[PDB]
Paper text:
We previously identified a circular bacteriocin [name] from Lactiplantibacillus plantarum B21 (previously known as [name]). This family II circular bacteriocin has antimicrobial activity against foodborne pathogens including Listeria monocytogenes and Clostridium perfringens and other closely related Lactobacillus species. Of these, circular bacteriocins (class I) have gained attention due to their unique characteristics of high thermal and pH stability, as well as resistance to degradation by many proteolytic enzymes. The covalently linked N- and C-termini form a structurally distinct cyclic peptide backbone.
In the present study, we report the crystal structure of [name]. A crystal from these conditions diffracted to 1.8 Å resolution and belonged to the space group C2221. The crystal structure diffraction data were phased by molecular replacement using a theoretical α-helix (8 residues long polyalanine) as a search model. There are two independent molecules of [name] in the asymmetric unit. The structures of these two molecules (Chain A and Chain B) are similar to each other, with a Cα backbone root-mean-square deviation, RMSD of 0.56 Å across 58 Cα atoms. The four α-helices in the crystal structure are connected by loops of 1 to 6 residues and enclose a hydrophobic core in a tightly folded globular arrangement. Helix α1 and helix α4 are linked covalently between Ile1 and Ala58 in the middle of helix α4, creating a circular backbone. The second, third and fourth α-helices are predominantly hydrophobic, with the linked amino acids at the N- and C-termini in helix α4 buried in the core of the structure. In contrast, helix α1 is amphipathic, with hydrophilic residues (Thr14, Gln18, Ser25 and Ser26) exposed at the surface of the protein. The protein has an overall net charge of + 3 at physiological pH, with four cationic residues located in helix α1 (Lys15 and Lys19), helix α4 (Arg6) and the loop connecting α1/α4 (His11), and one anionic residue located in helix α1 (Asp22).
Residue numbers in the entry: 1 to 58
Write the structure that this text describes.
């Protein structure tokens, strides 16, 4: 989540992180979480690059 926020210009709050992590952990895809929570439509290469990290780092 941190890498996404950094690379795509999102102001990341602790609340946005908390929501994203729970949703990812429950089974929503990294792309959908990025779009819905972080407001960022990720290209394919960015979904892959972020997905290589642990969830908080992603």
């Amino acid at each position: 989540i941190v890498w996404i926020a950094r690379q795509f210009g999102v102001h990341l709050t602790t609340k946005l992180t908390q929501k994203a992590l729970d949703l990812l952990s429950s089974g929503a895809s990294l792309g959908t979480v990025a779009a819905v929570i972080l407001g960022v439509t990720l290209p394919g290469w960015a979904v892959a690059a972020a997905g290589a990290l642990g969830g908080t780092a992603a």
